[PDB]
Amino acid sequence: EAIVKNYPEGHKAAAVLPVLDLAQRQNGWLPISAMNKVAEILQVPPMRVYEVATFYTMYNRK
Amino acid sequence: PKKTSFGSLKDEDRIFTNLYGRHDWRLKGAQSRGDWYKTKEILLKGPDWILGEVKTSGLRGRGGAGFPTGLKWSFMNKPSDGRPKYLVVNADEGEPGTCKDREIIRHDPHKLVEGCLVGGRAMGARAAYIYIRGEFYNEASNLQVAIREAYEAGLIGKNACGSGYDFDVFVVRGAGAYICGEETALIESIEGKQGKPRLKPPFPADVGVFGCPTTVANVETVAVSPTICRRGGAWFASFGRERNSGTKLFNISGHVNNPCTVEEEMSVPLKELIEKHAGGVTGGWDNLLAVIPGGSSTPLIPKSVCETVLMDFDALIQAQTGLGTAAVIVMDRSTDIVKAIARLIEFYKHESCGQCTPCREGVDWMNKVMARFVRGDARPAEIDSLWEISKQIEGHTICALGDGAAWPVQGLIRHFRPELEERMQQFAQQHQ
Amino acid sequence: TRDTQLITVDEKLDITTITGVPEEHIKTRKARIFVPARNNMQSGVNNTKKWKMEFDTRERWENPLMGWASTADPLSNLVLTFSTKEDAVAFAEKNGWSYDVEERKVPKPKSKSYGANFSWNKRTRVSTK
Numbered sequence: 299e300a301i302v303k304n305y306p307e308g309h310k311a312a313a314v315l316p317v318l319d320l321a322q323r324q325n326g327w328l329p330i331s332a333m334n335k336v337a338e339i340l341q342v343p344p345m346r347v348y349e350v351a352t353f354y355t356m357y358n359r360k
Numbered sequence: 361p362k363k364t365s366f367g368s369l370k371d372e373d374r375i376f377t378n379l380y381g382r383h384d385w386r387l388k389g390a391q392s393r394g395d396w397y398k399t400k401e402i403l404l405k406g407p408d409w410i411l412g413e414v415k416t417s418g419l420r421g422r423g424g425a426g427f428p429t430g431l432k433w434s435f436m437n438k439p440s441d442g443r444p445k446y447l448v449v450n451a452d453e454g455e456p457g458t459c460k461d462r463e464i465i466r467h468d469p470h471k472l473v474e475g476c477l478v479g480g481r482a483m484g485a486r487a488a489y490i491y492i493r494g495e496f497y498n499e500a501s502n503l504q505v506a507i508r509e510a511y512e513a514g515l516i517g518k519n520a521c522g523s524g525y526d527f528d529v530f531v532v533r534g535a536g537a538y539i540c541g542e543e544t545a546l547i548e549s550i551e552g553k554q555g556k557p558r559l560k561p562p563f564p565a566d567v568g569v570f571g572c573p574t575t576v577a578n579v580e581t582v583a584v585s586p587t588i589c590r591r592g593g594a595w596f597a598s599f600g601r602e603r604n605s606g607t608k609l610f611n612i613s614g615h616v617n618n619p620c621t622v623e624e625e626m627s628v629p630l631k632e633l634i635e636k637h638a639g640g641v642t643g644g645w646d647n648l649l650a651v652i653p654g655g656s657s658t659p660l661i662p663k664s665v666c667e668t669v670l671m672d673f674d675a676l677i678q679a680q681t682g683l684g685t686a687a688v689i690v691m692d693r694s695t696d697i698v699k700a701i702a703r704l705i706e707f708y709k710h711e712s713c714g715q716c717t718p719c720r721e722g723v724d725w726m727n728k729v730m731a732r733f734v735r736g737d738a739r740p741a742e743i744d745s746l747w748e749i750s751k752q753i754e755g756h757t758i759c760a761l762g763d764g765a766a767w768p769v770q771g772l773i774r775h776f777r778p779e780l781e782e783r784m785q786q787f788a789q790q791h792q
Numbered sequence: 793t794r795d796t797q798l799i800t801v802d803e804k805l806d807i808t809t810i811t812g813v814p815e816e817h818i819k820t821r822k823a824r825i826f827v828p829a830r831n832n833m834q835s836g837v838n839n840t841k842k843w844k845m846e847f848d849t850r851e852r853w854e855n856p857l858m859g860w861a862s863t864a865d866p867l868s869n870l871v872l873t874f875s876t877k878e879d880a881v882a883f884a885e886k887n888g889w890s891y892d893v894e895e896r897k898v899p900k901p902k903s904k905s906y907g908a909n910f911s912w913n914k915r916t917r918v919s920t921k
């Protein structure tokens with residue numbers, strides 16, 4: 299909630315990187331079900347979270 | 361007067377006076393060294409006065425592009441429409457050889473925070489987003505704490521410094537990408553997408569983050585602006601040659617005895633910089649081979665040019681290279697000069713975002729060719745082929761990462777061609 | 793100007809009787825006058841410059857020996873190229889062919905803005921690049 303309130307209303311998608319990293323910090327790695335969850339919370343299409351997940355190297359998909 | 365010699369910056373004229381973190385980095389210590397002093401008076405002067413001091417000082421972007429900051433920050437001094445305006449501080453610092461912006465963040469966090477407020481005030485910005493690479497988790501945390509102390513002290517937030525100006529300072533962590541250091545690729549990363557640069561126009565001053573007027577500025581450029589306002593533009597402009605003013609943070613790494621970050625005057629001779637601070641080239645000056653004078657993105661120069669080159673934007677341009685981030689990398693005579701540059705092209709092939717064809721396909725191409733020049737597994741005609749390829753990439757890409765993949769190659773081919781042709785000779789006689 | 797002594801002819805030009813064409817393929821053939829549509833697989837627009845005249849498709853059957861496509865229409869592969877719609881229509885009239893004309897279709901000018909992809913409050917903002 300604190301993360302999402304850092305961005306203008308109407309631009310929740312800007313929280314994809316921090317919230318996706320928060321999933322990795324809680325779990326250690328990003329399973330497909332973690333990215334699917336971040337898509338639900340921020341209401342961005344899942345494919346747009348898969349793009350972010352595979353673009354940056356600090357995310358562990360294994 | 362016009363001192364024609366430069367260097368020997370005195371400890372009283374240094375801006376980043378906590379560069380080594382031997383004094384307290386928190387708010388209490390920072391104010392004891394000058395930070396957050398008379399900031400209210402600076403803000404009440406207004407944006408026109410602030411932009412006046414930045415222009416007069418001749419401050420130029422420390423992020424590597426080296427544009428006039430005063431002119432760049434003036435695109436934001438226009439009447440607003442319905443959109444908010446933002447200042448984005450570029451704390452990504454991914455350039456190999458560069459580590460100056462790391463020191464500022466974890467040892468002088470309050471200088472950056474005051475730069476954001478002063479700089480944000482000049483541009484009419486409602487907040488500053490500080491984008492710091494994800495690897496710097498401890499340096500970002502330090503900055504986040506200093507941001508808290510400023511909030512609790514009334515220095516930022518609602519009615520910042522008591523001046524009746526409302527300002528916010530946000531920290532956003534990256535997730536691993538050298539390409540997100542590019543100004544537009546940073547913006548797309550803040551907005552939640554892949555770090556892929558945008559074409560220009562539009563320019564960020566018109567359409568930036570969230571689609572609003574934005575200015576992206578480096579950590580070091582923002583961090584020095586409050587001091588330029590307190591001490592005046594003329595004081596800053598008193599250093600370095602003309603159109604090359606100010607102090608500058610230098611990293612000296614590679615084959616030196618004492619690698620170190622250090623502050624020194626702009627336009628100091630490169631040799632004097634290495635010898636006095638870094639402890640000389642490993643094995644003595646006569647053991648020097650070539651120096652990359654501004655991080656990997658700039659061409660390397662040989663020992664002959666290194667004798668009498670000055671460290672400023674214009675002196676290095678006429679050396680066919682650039683000041684860049686001013687990250688001096690030294691390579692001594694035992695270095696495999698071909699293999700050093702091959703690893704740089706491998707770095708770029710790993711960082712290219714893949715968006716646009718010349719860099720997606722070209723840099724990956726130059727990586728394959730350089731991998732063979734290291735083994736000598738080629739024929740001399742491929743050297744000129746690689747030169748032509750590097751020119752097809754340069755100036756044809758969306759962003760400057762493509763240009764910076766080519767320039768390392770052009771430097772090696774420009775000055776060490778006999779080294780390349782020599783290594784091809786050995787492989788041929790061995791295998792034939 | 794001219795030295796040869798001209799004459800006046802007010803009749804509309806018709807050459808059906810001297811073309812040598814059989815009666816069947818003049819009276820019962822409908823000629824189509826059109827600018828060919830752009831092949832949608834490619835983006836080039838170089839084949840949409842001229843006017844074409846083509847005739848109605850007729851029966852093609854399978855050859856009992858090898859299965860090839862047999863035809864009995866002498867005009868199956870005939871295609872004429874014209875600079876203007878008026879030349880094409882002029883040609884068909886003097887040859888006695890019934891015809892249709894189809895107006896050239898031209899893509900309307902579009903409003904393309906790169907900056908729209910990053911709009912502050914509009915739906916044209918793109919979710920990806």
Ligand SMILES: Cc1cc2nc3c(=O)[nH]c(=O)nc-3n(C[C@H](O)[C@H](O)[C@H](O)COP(=O)(O)O)c2cc1C
Binds near residue numbers: 432538
């Ligand atoms: C591939 C690439 C990486 C870059 N990385 C950085 C960086 O890490 N830090 C930085 O300040 N500028 C970086 N830049 C330059 C920025 O695009 C931009 O010029 C800079 O943020 C402007 O800051 P300044 O005007 O204060 O110098 C990079 C540019 C490119 C093309």
Ligand code: SF4
Binds near residue numbers: 714715720757
């Ligand atoms: S030059 Fe390379 S990094 Fe820059 S936009 Fe093109 S592909 Fe991406």
